[PDB]
Design a protein around this ligand. Structure first.
Ligand SMILES: CC(C)(O)C#Cc1ccc2[nH]cc(-c3ccnc(N)n3)c2c1
Length: 297
């Protein structure tokens, strides 16, 4: 069934406690690090599996080491049965935290402050020549330590693609590129099976923040890829912002203006979040909604 059993020790060092995630791609375990005495995340991929994707995931994670909002890399390896990566263990993902909120909504305070962090992570992965291509709330996790629990960390590079060649140029888009990310947060371009660009990661961010602040997207009950693309294509997006800060029109109009070839104005989007906080007197060091101060006073 699973690749690693319960109590399996990888490289004499990382001992499986339980499976915390998995699909077609590979599986993710919580492990005890026998050297450091710390719990770690262990992600594994079958050595035979026809698509060898973990190799690319580790390469991305390694390039990003030293950026904020990135899991600390601990180790990786390869044998006859599986490839694996060991990374610092984070806490709960934003989909789990949003569904724990009484109405499935975050405050503007939580929404805007998570937005700044996710924006920073998107620019970071773009800055080392990669698209995420599956930006969604379950791919961000809060830290679990006193130094990290107010930090949001980007996970799961399993659908990432290098958008540059080996010498830093933007590579030519394929005329058709089959979109295989999550329906709910996919850009209209993704829905049309266009080559995805940096802008398409920022669309996914746009839709996440609306959904955080409002509790839902208009197409939430529709799972069909094609039906959802047809709804988004027609949807008057300025209407998503009816109950959002007016600065979010600057965000919408910007990413609407972008194409596959054009570098986003990340600072423009950051200033939207920053101006939206400043207008409502929102301080950076406020409790997140899920904290004792956040779930109380
Ligand atoms: C960055 C990389 C190597 O591509 C990755 C991943 C990934 C995918 C799916 C996952 N599901 C849950 C986690 C997870 C949970 C807690 N703490 C950490 N570091 N992860 C998780 C991590």
């Amino acid at each position: 069934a699973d690749i690693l059993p319960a109590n399996y020790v990888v490289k004499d060092r990382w001992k499986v406690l339980k499976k915390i995630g998995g699909g077609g791609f590979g599986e993710i375990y919580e492990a005890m690090d026998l050297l450091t005495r710390e719990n770690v995340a262990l992600k594994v991929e079958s050595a035979q599996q026809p698509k060898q994707v973990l190799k690319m995931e580790v390469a991305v994670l390694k390039k990003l080491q030293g950026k904020d909002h990135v899991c600390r890399f601990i180790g990786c390896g390869r044998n006859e049965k599986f490839n694996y990566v060991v990374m610092q263990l984070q806490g709960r993902n934003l989909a789990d935290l949003r569904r724990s909120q009484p109405r499935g909504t975050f405050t503007l305070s939580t929404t805007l402050r998570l937005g700044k962090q996710i924006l920073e992570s998107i620019e970071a992965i773009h800055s080392v020549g990669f698209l995420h291509r599956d930006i969604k709330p379950s791919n961000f996790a809060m830290g679990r330590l006193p130094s990290t629990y107010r930090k949001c960390y980007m996970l799961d590079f399993g659908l990432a693609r290098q958008y540059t060649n080996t010498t830093g140029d933007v590579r030519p888009p394929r005329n058709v590129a089959g979109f295989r990310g999550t329906v709910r947060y996919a850009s209209v371009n993704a829905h049309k099976n266009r080559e995805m660009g940096r802008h398409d990661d920022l669309w996914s961010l746009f839709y996440m923040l609306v959904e955080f602040a409002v509790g839902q997207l208009p197409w939430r009950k529709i799972k069909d890829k094609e039906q959802v693309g047809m709804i988004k294509e027609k949807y008057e997006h300025r209407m998503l912002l009816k109950h959002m800060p007016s600065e979010f029109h600057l965000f919408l109009d910007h990413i609407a203006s972008l194409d596959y070839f054009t570098k986003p104005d990340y600072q423009l989007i950051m200033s939207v979040f920053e101006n939206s906080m400043k207008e409502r007197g929102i301080a950076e060091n406020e409790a997140f909604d899920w904290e004792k101060a956040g779930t109380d006073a």
